């Protein structure tokens, strides 16, 4: 009679909360989805071993089209868990699944976990200064999406930071790198000429948040565009005007050039 | 030797991540602060029992003025952990403490935990649509803080949602309720008259996120301003223009007036 939406956290199998783990262990059936994002620091096998339960992974179609036929039926007479990377309901489509549960007469509860949306706090940038967020999508064919460029423009204009989620091919396990994202942004700039993203733009790269050894780097595009930030996943942030304390953290912790203390504050 | 900044999560002792718990259990000394937020579903005793270590609680003064005298010295010859509610670097000034750690020759690591900043996804509002955040501070003496009003104004004009962290005076055991925040906002509106926060404004209240049954309510200020949302902590959200799916969730899950389904495109 109960469905639990449980977040797996940021990077590996230990990023689930104690609450999430204990609840998952007591569930009769455990499902999971790895299409909104992936858990790069672990494997389904390691997650299954930790939870001590077999996990049925669902595709995007299984969820969007058949959630009420695959998951909810079992939730009617059993305790069922639905695992998702990060924090449940951060992904935009997740929320509506609770409505489906309600329609099916199934109670649902949410067990939170760390999300990249909040983990960016480790960049030293003040959380309240982050504005609207966006996703940098790979262009393909004659389709060249550029809405994320306008998001940066509008946030930066108001002195706000922009969190950019990077594209991912869940099935093919292909992750867009911060390097690729920077190249794309320079390409959009060359097309729009808005003076929003150039070689002189200060950026912050956060790779493998959740890991004990994430890569946190800050610097100008001209210097970071070909830098190796390590294995995925990567997150790109375009800061707005910096508070001196934010800048000092970027210099001391993220190896940012001293120049940012006079140019971006 | 090492210093770990470990988040404890949203509501109770089990909101810590498995990673955080396994590391905390092996540390030589464990410190913590409980003034940046309120964990309404646990006690110091329960946290100590879970980690199996005595926790020395520090006051705001101990941390801001003496972190380098109380915590860092021990981290030079031992494994030390510093615990905080929610995520340690979200809506706190703790990031700067990593700079102090470095200057003292102490390596630091960060272990994330669920944060209210991302938990608001449970309201059904799209996380990417949240703009700049703000804090509603208690007026004191003859000074009445009003910056948060301008934040809502700026976000709303852009169709973005506004997360409003509410004030806390941990030593006085004072936790601002959503009701008190609404009363303050109405007073600022009477002054600035920007049509930003009125009795007809739609708002969302999230209380005790992290618990299994948090209070999630949406409706007009005139109807919610005197409603009992239960024990603290509370956060107030002023949505911008809603997507149909957001409206549907607010109606189905947060009890919002069915009339909000009819969005004005
Ligand atoms: N479980 C919870 N439910 C509702 N609001 C919460 C909350 N935890 C924190 N808050 C809100 O956030 C304020 C503290 S701000 C510190 C936040 C913390 N670092 C985190 O990551 O969550 C509180 O005064 C309250 O308004």
UniProtKB/Swiss-Prot annotation, chains A, B:
GO biological process, one term: protein histidyl modification to diphthamide
Catalytic activity: 2-[(3S)-amino-3-carboxypropyl]-L-histidyl-[translation elongation factor 2] + 3 S-adenosyl-L-methionine = diphthine-[translation elongation factor 2] + 3 S-adenosyl-L-homocysteine + 3 H(+)
Keyword Methyltransferase: yes
Keyword S-adenosyl-L-methionine part of the UniProt annotation: yes
Functional summary from the UniProt entry: S-adenosyl-L-methionine-dependent methyltransferase that catalyzes the trimethylation of the amino group of the modified target histidine residue in translation elongation factor 2 (EF-2), to form an intermediate called diphthine. The three successive methylation reactions represent the second step of diphthamide biosynthesis.
Enzyme Commission no: 2.1.1.98
Positions annotated to bind S-adenosyl-L-methionine: 10, 87, 90, 115-116, 166, 209, 234
Protein name (record): Diphthine synthase
Stored PANTHER family: DIPHTHINE METHYL ESTER SYNTHASE, DIPHTHINE SYNTHASE
Superkingdom per UniProt: Archaea
Taxonomic source organism: Pyrococcus horikoshii (strain ATCC 700860 / DSM 12428 / JCM 9974 / NBRC 100139 / OT-3)
A Gene Ontology molecular function term of the record: diphthine synthase activity
Pfam family, one: TP_methylase
Family: Belongs to the diphthine synthase family.
Gene name of the record: dphB
């Amino acid at each position: 009679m109960v469905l639990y939406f449980i977040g797996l956290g940021l990077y590996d199998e230990r990023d689930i909360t104690v609450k999430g783990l204990e609840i998952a262990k007591k569930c009769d059936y455990v499902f999971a989805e790895f299409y909104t994002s992936l858990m790069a620091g672990t494997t389904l096998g390691r997650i299954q071993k930790l939870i001590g339960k077999e996990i049925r992974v669902l595709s995007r179609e299984d969820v969007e089209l058949n959630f009420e036929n695959i998951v909810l039926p079992l939730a009617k007479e059993n305790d069922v868990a639905f695992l998702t990377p990060g924090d449940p309901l951060v992904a935009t489509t997740h929320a509506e699944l609770r409505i489906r549960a309600k329609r099916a007469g199934v109670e649902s509860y949410v067990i939170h976990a760390p999300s990249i949306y909040s983990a960016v706090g480790i960049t030293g940038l003040h959380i309240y200064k982050f504005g609207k967020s966006a996703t940098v999508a790979y262009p393909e064919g004659e389709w060249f999406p550029t809405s994320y460029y306008d998001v940066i423009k509008e946030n930066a204009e108001r002195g706000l930071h922009t969190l950019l989620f990077l594209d991912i091919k869940a099935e093919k396990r292909m992750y867009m790198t911060a390097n690729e994202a920077m190249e794309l942004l320079l390409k959009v700039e060359d097309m729009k000429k808005g003076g929003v993203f150039t070689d002189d733009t200060l950026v912050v790269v956060l790779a493998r948040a959740g890991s004990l050894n994430p890569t946190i780097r800050a610097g100008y595009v001209k210097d970071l565009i070909r830098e190796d930030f390590g294995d995925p996943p990567h997150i790109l942030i375009v800061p707005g005007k910096l508070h001196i304390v934010e800048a000092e953290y970027l210099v001391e912790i993220a190896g940012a050039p001293r120049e940012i203390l006079r140019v971006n504050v």
